[PDB]
Amino acid sequence: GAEIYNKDGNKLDLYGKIDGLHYFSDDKSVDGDQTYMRVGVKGETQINDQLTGYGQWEYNVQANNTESSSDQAWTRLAFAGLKFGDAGSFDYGRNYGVVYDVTSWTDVLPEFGGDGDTYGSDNFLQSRANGVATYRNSDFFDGLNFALQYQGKNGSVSGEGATNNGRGWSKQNGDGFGTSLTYDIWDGISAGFAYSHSKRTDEQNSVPALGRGDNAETYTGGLKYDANNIYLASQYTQTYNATRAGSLGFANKAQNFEVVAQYQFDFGLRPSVAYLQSKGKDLERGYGDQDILKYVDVGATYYFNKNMSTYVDYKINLLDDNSFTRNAGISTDDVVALGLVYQF
Amino acid sequence: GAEIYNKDGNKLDLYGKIDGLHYFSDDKSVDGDQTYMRVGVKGETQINDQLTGYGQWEYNVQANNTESSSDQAWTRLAFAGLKFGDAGSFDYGRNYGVVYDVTSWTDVLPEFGGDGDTYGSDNFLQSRANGVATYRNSDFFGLVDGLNFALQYQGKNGSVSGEGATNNGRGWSKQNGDGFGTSLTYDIWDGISAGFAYSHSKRTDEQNSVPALGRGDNAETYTGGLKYDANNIYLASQYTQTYNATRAGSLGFANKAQNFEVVAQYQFDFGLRPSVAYLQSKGKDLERGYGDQDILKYVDVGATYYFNKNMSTYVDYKINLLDDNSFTRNAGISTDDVVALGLVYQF
Amino acid sequence: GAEIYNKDGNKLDLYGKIDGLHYFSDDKSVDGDQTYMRVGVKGETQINDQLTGYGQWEYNVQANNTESSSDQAWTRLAFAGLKFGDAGSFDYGRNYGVVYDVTSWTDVLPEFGGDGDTYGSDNFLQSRANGVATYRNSDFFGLVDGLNFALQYQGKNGSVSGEGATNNGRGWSKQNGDGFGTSLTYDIWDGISAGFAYSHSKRTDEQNSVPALGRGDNAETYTGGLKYDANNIYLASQYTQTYNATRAGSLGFANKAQNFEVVAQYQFDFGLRPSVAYLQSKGKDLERGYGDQDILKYVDVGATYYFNKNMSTYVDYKINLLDDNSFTRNAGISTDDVVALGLVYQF
């Protein structure tokens, strides 16, 4: 983040990165150039002694396709808020669902991991989401962070279930809420829990073959060790009608586990190993139990300084190629990524 | 505000906002999350004692849809110009048609009003438009304080292909032929103002052949308006008569229309700013049996609370007065009420 | 320019322009408003005494169409890199192919010329390209002053689907296989420069099956250029011979092509810069009975007035010498003349 303005109680921070990134894989929908950049602004205005206003915007711009390609930029974050001293905060807009307050702890791989793996974006309150109202509280009115979050319906393009901002069933949601709780038990050791409950939409219960139910729910617990140049974290999440069974629908229930170990050398190298799986249960069309995601991750980042880094990441895919993985379009091939990153 | 660069006669102002916004309505095409942000840059360069060069860009970025959605960002303004002291200024690009130099006086509602209501964008010289050349003069060459005028030309913006095409083609509703416009505002006191604007554009072939409604070779607008803005009080009205220029929803254009807007506001010292307004658009001589039809009719009541110059919150309540009829249904015109709630950070 | 951040060994430069631009032409796909803007960031971080890290992004935003139009913005450049003192530099991203290290010498017309004429973007290593790794060496390891060379590799950018696919698939016209290129330039005197460039890329199976024109496993370019730049005079020429690498409009590629560009300019002290140029592209051995064909042929006359480093105005007149024939019609190649007028704010 680069502070480009700070005057009369108003500050403006410009941030972002250019990620020169290549993927190597037998999966042709993944293989090739993946260069992209992100640009954002964080703004803060002092209102009074007990009140600060703020806003943030984060934009993703792909740079790996041609100058006539379409749909190459999208907003990741866009929200405005009030901070009432230390007595917490409120914001509304496109922001992270509170489930990520805990699952973010395993989202630290050099390249892979995070949204797209055990959960996705626009996926109820599991990641970035449209129309979230988020109340947060530090030190529970000590060191104990609480959030409560509401999300209005984001429905179909047209018909009964429509809203202004309609989309496909995979990215729809009804009215929902979430809550998170995180705590530093020792110095360095944190624990966290999160819960979300959302109504599903009529299209989610009629267009895809997989996943039926009135409500989507997530229960998450997570642990993190972050001291002494060591980073360990795990996340265990159980879901009902909330995890995507590739292109085929949702899984009636799923169990997602993510664990990672890393070490940070003084001279800037940071090796990383991780394991991720997603186990879907009670799937329609005779699928039954099925692996949705399963891989070991190894790689490393070298940090030249706080503004420049290079990395390699290797996804060792353990999924077996079967009828479910083919029909749902889930990749079973390995991937290697190489990148060079400038950040500001 | 936000001057991020001011060095050797060149300055750069980065401005914009992040508007956390939700609509509540029985209209499903309007209801729900409406979060969006604006970002722009105002730049100015001193060339010599008598000559300043400038440009401005303004972009709108929706944040209310997904990361795989289409067409979520667009340019509102992009223009470059020269200012020659009190001999006037000239700019070319995407800019406001001069009609808006008067109708902007009523575009002060907490959330509603403005483009989308009695006029829209890419709607001849009524709002933001492609390819306008605009000459402006303030205080009549420095000789008459408070007297401003504008002269404006717009090149044809035509079909996607065929005979009527230009490089930058669009659908008939946002097309225009060659056109011009003029405006004139006068500050009688330092709070009271009167203003007039006129425009005349050629219509294109698609505007006369594709939609069912509206026939004619020319689009004309006549606008008069009044404004009181002082002593914490804001009263403004605008009356506009149009010919082949006002959209009849998706069905075409109204052969003639009468648009009226009026608004009253008060700014309390602690930062609350209530607002009441009334807006209507009456269409006349519509084809296919429609005859005279209301295109828009509503009362608006709301309020903005300014925390400071960088942060506000607002409610706005559109009490819709249209009857649900054959015209409104076939033209895609909303007849439902709307409530808006917003929280806005601005820089 | 516009250094908006410089602190603790890290620098950020915000650059761009707002170009208010109109084209006049009988060619209706070219005629009309062409206003656009560019915005960019050049970033630099000192890592140690011998090593600098850097990144650059450049975005093109059209402003000549409506707020509901599609595909109005795109990335021209996006790359990250390391500079190793005088051992050289390495960057990867969307960047210029090295052939343009020489052909850029003739890309100096007031408005026309450059990509879109004798070569295009996403056209192997002739202009801006996805996925280029580029090594550059200055002054031949600090030894021979004015001698620069570059070595470049590009990975496959393939079809949207099927056997030839990559993640970032596109049309046959903008596809490439694995490829490499090299450039060499030398300032023989001050003001005078010579340069060579070569490139070799595999072609894709879609390029050899979908369009009717152009067959071969490999695309190749050979380029030589000269430049005089001194005493307020600018002269430059570029000659390029290509194999399976030059677009024959929409119909495919030319099995062989010969491209030639030459330009002459003078800079007057009061800011006027007149320009005259000639560009041709001659295609050989085209299938379907086309044979030898002119792909491009025009004389260019124009001028730019620089008010200062931040503002300019210009006119350019393309005098088109192509004869209208069945090749030009079917390939979509314009044979009409065009005048451009522009007013530009730059930061």
Numbering used by the authors:
A (entry chain A): 0 to 140, 144 to 346
B (entry chain C), C (entry chain B): 0 to 346
Which sentences from the paper describe this structure?
Data from OmpK36, which crystallizes in the monoclinic space group C2, were collected at a wavelength of λ = 3.54 Å. In total 12 sulfur atoms are found, from two methionine residues and two sulfates in the trimeric structure. For OmpK36, the analytical absorption correction (AC) gives equivalent merging R factors to spherical harmonics correction (SH), with an overall R merge of 0.119 for both. Notably, the AC strategy leads to an increase in the mean I/σ(I), from 16.42 (SH) to 21.37 (AC), and a stronger anomalous signal, as measured by the anomalous slope (1.69 with AC, as opposed to 1.31 with SH). AC generally gives better results than SH, with the exception of the heights of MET310 in chain B and SO4-1 in chain C, which are larger in the SH data. A clear trend is visible: the analytical absorption correction (AC) is better than the spherical harmonics correction (SH) and the combination of the two (ACSH) improves the data even further. In contrast to the spherical harmonics, the analytical absorption correction is not dependent on multiple observations, and hence is ideally suited for crystals in low-symmetry space groups or for radiation-sensitive crystals at long wavelengths.
